[PDB]
Amino acid sequence: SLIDPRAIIDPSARLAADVQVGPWSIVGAEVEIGEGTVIGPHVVLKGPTKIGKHNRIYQFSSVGEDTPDLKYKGEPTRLVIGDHNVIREGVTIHRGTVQDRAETTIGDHNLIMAYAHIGHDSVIGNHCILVNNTALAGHVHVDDWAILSGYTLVHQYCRIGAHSFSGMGSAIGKDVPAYVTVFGNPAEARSMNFEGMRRRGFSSEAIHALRRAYKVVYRQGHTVEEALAELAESAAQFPEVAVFRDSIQSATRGITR
Amino acid sequence: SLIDPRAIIDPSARLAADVQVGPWSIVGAEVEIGEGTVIGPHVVLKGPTKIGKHNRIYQFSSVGEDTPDLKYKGEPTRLVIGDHNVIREGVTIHRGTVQDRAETTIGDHNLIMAYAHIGHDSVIGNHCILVNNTALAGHVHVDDWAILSGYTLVHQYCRIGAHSFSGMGSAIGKDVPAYVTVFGNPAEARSMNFEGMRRRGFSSEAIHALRRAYKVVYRQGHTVEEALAELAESAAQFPEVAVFRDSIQSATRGITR
Amino acid sequence: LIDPRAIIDPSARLAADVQVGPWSIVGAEVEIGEGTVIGPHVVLKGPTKIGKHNRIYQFSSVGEDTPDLKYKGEPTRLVIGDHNVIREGVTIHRGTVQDRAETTIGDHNLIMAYAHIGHDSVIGNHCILVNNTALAGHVHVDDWAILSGYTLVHQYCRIGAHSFSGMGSAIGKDVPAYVTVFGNPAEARSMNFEGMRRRGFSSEAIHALRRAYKVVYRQGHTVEEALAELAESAAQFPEVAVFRDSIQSATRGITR
């Protein structure tokens, strides 16, 4: 049987008909699970939480717990996870807080490796990779295709841009623009994720435009406001450069330099 | 029933009124648990260990294990935990060693977040916050109201002062005086935790006196002895400054600079 | 010995004397050797061979597939030797066909809580990996090495015999035998004299190693020049030859 008899399935939980649940796993009240999702053994799921289709959740994960953050006071808040995600061993994923939008959100086709932490009110897009013990403190936005190497630490409210990359052990206290590569503690900008871009099939023209955009922001002594003005032209020509420019414009904690 | 039948409760364990134990948890021999304490599912408690009242311990925590530091364990050694603490997912807390204190001690109103590690013979006071994956290597003393941010690493024997703060990813190798903020690997002193003082309702005069005290110790080229002598007058006027002065006086192995 | 609340696959193979705690899973094609104690809440997946007198603590996942995207379902293995202690929440992944299809651990190793041993890593004997040490993949750790808490090791790095990392080190290049490294990024500081004394090295060998460190690190030599300068001492002291050989095998540079 797909649902192990040693699992605890709350009567309010809603499981699509071919969901699998391993032994000694807990599917709490107000947890909804979509078709084809496999829950391993020793998993704790707490609601209100919606999990989509064809996910996989490994042992010793805690998905949908309250944040311990002292600003949370027992309010009805949610977690939403999309489709085709892989959540590895011991991952912790907390629900949102009413102070923000009362929801933690994860998109599709993400890979969240062992002992990663996804703090309250974080928003992960699609196709992201969080390597072992990556920790998102709270309110962290990770845009599509971003890769955070092992033991990357991300401060509350930070944004991590699309197709960006952090080296192992990075401690990110300011925003990481789209396509930027960062390393170290504190995290330093070291150019763009050109290898990731080439692998994903970005055009040579867009890569060239992005190389120039990086110079405008980082290498010409401009203030952020002067850089944004100087980027307007290239951003109007290349969507990739608009994604870069928009990531700089939405930065609330300054940008990683 | 408050005690789940799928839990294993040793016959020598002692459980007070309103104790709850979740499924697949182990309450070992010589574990005592005080009133109102909630043990989650998948928790391992090992003794001899005394846990006080109204605590909460989350899934996948191992509380009371022997340290792996010594290859041949001593017995008996103890772990004492006070009241109103919250110990989150996957936290490890080791008992003391026969050489040293023979006890690991945690006070009241602490918040120990996911995957934190409290090594053998450590002593935590009251109202502390250890953020995710904070690791106290052994024999570490953390005084009241200290905050250690995510993935703070503390070397053996170090003392963390009252109301101090470490930034995320700090690696602390020397004592942190009361109120002092430290960052980085290796950790360096930056300023004081003025926000914490204001939260505690310190007077503007005490805060001003603490700002001056930081300069006396860090910024005027005094030896520690001289600084202690220069602080005597302010320390006699302000109990808050006495706390600072005392933390410097007790630092026999140097202070974080 | 085998708790009735454990799940033992019919294709698993347990020696006599093996203990398995409640709510542990011993998966298909897992073999376990005599005297090995599996705690409660342990997940073992195969094909995996575990030797004798090991102890594996709760919440460990031993023998899972790597989530690394290059691993595509292939039959890969994991081999663990004897007298190892694997503490709470340790994750150990099997190998990938791209390398040698095997993750390998030797004997008498102490792998502390939440350490991670990535695919195709090779650990020798008598090593200590302190809490949350992470070996990313294809990492070789030679005998008696000590990695302090939260030491991160990049793919393909080699960690020399008797070497020591300080807490929080991020290691991106090879660490020569005996060398002590600290920081992110990791930097060489000195030698692990304590480890030499633990092995009973003679005062002459220790003096020769102190001199060898200066040849490599403190006389402005290139690696090639240093290797040439070490040849004489290495021929005289096997302990120095271990150091020299660790430098010679470092094709991607040494930690400085």
Curated annotation (Swiss-Prot), chain C:
Principal location listed in the UniProt entry: cytoplasm
Sorted UniProt keywords: Acyltransferase, Cytoplasm, Lipid A biosynthesis, Lipid biosynthesis, Lipid metabolism, Repeat, Transferase
CDD domains linked to this entry: LbH_UDP-GlcNAc_AT
Record SUPFAM superfamilies: Trimeric LpxA-like enzymes
Catalytic activity: a (3R)-hydroxyacyl-[ACP] + UDP-N-acetyl-alpha-D-glucosamine = a UDP-3-O-[(3R)-3-hydroxyacyl]-N-acetyl-alpha-D-glucosamine + holo-[ACP]
Record GO terms (molecular function): acyl-[acyl-carrier-protein]-UDP-N-acetylglucosamine O-acyltransferase activity
UniProt EC number: 2.3.1.129
GO cellular component term, pick one: membrane
Subcellular location as annotated: Cytoplasm
Transmembrane regions listed in the UniProt entry: none
PROSITE patterns: HEXAPEP_TRANSFERASES (PS00101)
GO biological process: lipid A biosynthetic process
Annotated pathway: Glycolipid biosynthesis; lipid IV(A) biosynthesis; lipid IV(A) from (3R)-3-hydroxytetradecanoyl-[acyl-carrier-protein] and UDP-N-acetyl-alpha-D-glucosamine: step 1/6
PANTHER family: ACYL-[ACYL-CARRIER-PROTEIN]--UDP-N-ACETYLGLUCOSAMINE O-ACYLTRANSFERASE (PTHR43480), ACYL-[ACYL-CARRIER-PROTEIN]--UDP-N-ACETYLGLUCOSAMINE O-ACYLTRANSFERASE, MITOCHONDRIAL-RELATED (PTHR43480:SF1)
Membership in a protein family: Belongs to the transferase hexapeptide repeat family. LpxA subfamily.
Subunit structure: Homotrimer.
HAMAP family found in the cross-reference section: LpxA (MF_00387)
NCBIfam families from the UniProt entry: lipid_A_lpxA, PRK05289.1
Function: Involved in the biosynthesis of lipid A, a phosphorylated glycolipid that anchors the lipopolysaccharide to the outer membrane of the cell.
Protein name, entry field: Acyl-[acyl-carrier-protein]--UDP-N-acetylglucosamine O-acyltransferase
Source lineage: Bacteria, Pseudomonadati, Pseudomonadota, Gammaproteobacteria, Pseudomonadales
Protein encoded by which gene: lpxA
